[PDB]
């Protein structure tokens with residue numbers, strides 16, 4: 001059916017998104033927020049359900065409407081997250097912690113852990129969240145945010161921009177290598193870790209300006225409080241990871257991992273990287289999804305195949321679809 005998954009916006013102009021129909025509200029008891037400042041902000045303004053549990057279609061519509069996230073990027077991220085962290089039978093995903101609100105769980109080894117689940121979507125060297133190894137991969141960390149402010153002062157004239165992103169991304173990688181014996185920086189996380197550092201410059205900057213320079217009040221508002229600036233206009237066109245190549249090239253890194261000790265970063269020659277986007281997709285579906293759903297029942301297999309078809313619609317690179325559970 002058309003509109004499943006949601007298609008691109010009919011009208012993708014800049015407009016007021018912090019409007020009277022979408023007020024910021026504080027959390028009620030039980031409301032879930034997680035490691036994504038974008039989704040957190042959409043939930044706290046009511047572009048998504050305010051309790052932080054949503055369907056993939058709700059998430060895709062929200063990121064497009066609220067931030068002008070581009071359609072393919074929205075589809076890929078949402079169905080990737082849903083496949084590994086969401087309930088495929090009830091069609092619900094938590095944007096944070098695991099919750100009974102996503103419905104009766106599937107059999108092990110599937111975890112349905114929400115976006116807080118480490119190593120599926122969420123991973124190491126986040127800008128404002130700590131690595132899961134240290135015990136909290138989802139809450140805003142003030143010390144890490146102050147480092148973002150310091151890098152913005154040093155490389156962005158007090159604003160966050162792609163130059164700042166290139167330097168901060170590398171700093172966070174180096175700090176995880178030095179401190180986290182389980183540091184993993186391969187495949188899907190290698191991709192998302194770099195792309196996410198562009199998002200504040202591309203999507204948190206008011207759309208009437210759209211100059212790639214994010215002020216620190218706005219940065220704190222999104223990253224800490226899940227709140228849009230007063231009178232915030234979304235970006236004037238659909239985008240996501242514009243300029244990711246600049247961030248990647250600031251300090252070229254190979255994908256790899258620490259091997260159970262600090263300072264043991266070992267390149268993984270089997271990992272995808274930005275030269276092999278189709279390999280990233282194929283490994284995600286053949287390996288990561290299969291590790292959660294190795295031998296699904298008929299009902300789960302059907303749900304997997306539908307969501308995998310939707311995932312493939314989000315692949316922006318020139319790739320062939322693969323079928324880990326046949327056709």
Ligand code: HEM
Nearest residue numbers: 035036038067069077081115122123126127128129196203
């Ligand atoms: C389209 C659906 C999306 C999903 C399911 C999603 C989910 C996630 C998840 C699970 C993370 C954790 C990655 C990590 O370990 O650092 C993350 C990172 C992030 N996402 Fe999203 N995201 C989405 C779209 C967006 C959008 C539209 C924005 C901005 C408008 C955004 C901004 C961010 C930022 C800034 C980070 C990194 C935060 C940090 O490192 O401190 N995301 N996302």
Ligand SMILES: *[C@@H]1O[C@H](CO)[C@@H](O)[C@H](O)[C@H]1NC(C)=O
Nearest residue numbers: 010011012013014015016017
């Ligand atoms: C598109 O939306 C913008 C902002 O709401 C508005 O200025 C413009 O007139 C709209 N165009 C159409 C054709 O609806």
Ligand SMILES: *[C@@H]1O[C@H](CO)[C@@H](O)[C@H](O)[C@H]1NC(C)=O
Nearest residue numbers: 118132133134135181182260
């Ligand atoms: C580190 O990795 C090991 C796998 O060898 C795992 O058992 C352990 O839970 C990880 N530690 C933390 C704190 O996440």
Ligand SMILES: *[C@@H]1O[C@H](CO)[C@@H](O)[C@H](O)[C@H]1NC(C)=O
Nearest residue numbers: 130134135136141142143144
């Ligand atoms: C916040 O991050 C800093 C810098 O990595 C870390 O030293 C500190 O333990 C983190 N705070 C919490 C509560 O984990």
Ligand SMILES: *[C@@H]1O[C@H](CO)[C@@H](O)[C@H](O)[C@H]1NC(C)=O
Nearest residue numbers: 155156157161162163164212
């Ligand atoms: C970041 O800001 C600095 C200082 O204003 C500027 O020199 C640099 O060109 C900016 N980078 C980008 C990508 O806008």
Ligand SMILES: *[C@@H]1O[C@H](CO)[C@@H](O)[C@H](O)[C@H]1NC(C)=O
Nearest residue numbers: 279282283286322323324325
């Ligand atoms: C994924 O599985 C398909 C067969 O279903 C195969 O053609 C493809 O090469 C596999 N890709 C990887 C990276 O394992």
Ligand SMILES: [Cl-]
Nearest residue numbers: 008070071238
């Ligand atoms: Cl689009």
Ligand SMILES: [Mg+2]
Nearest residue numbers: 122123124126
């Ligand atoms: Mg993380």
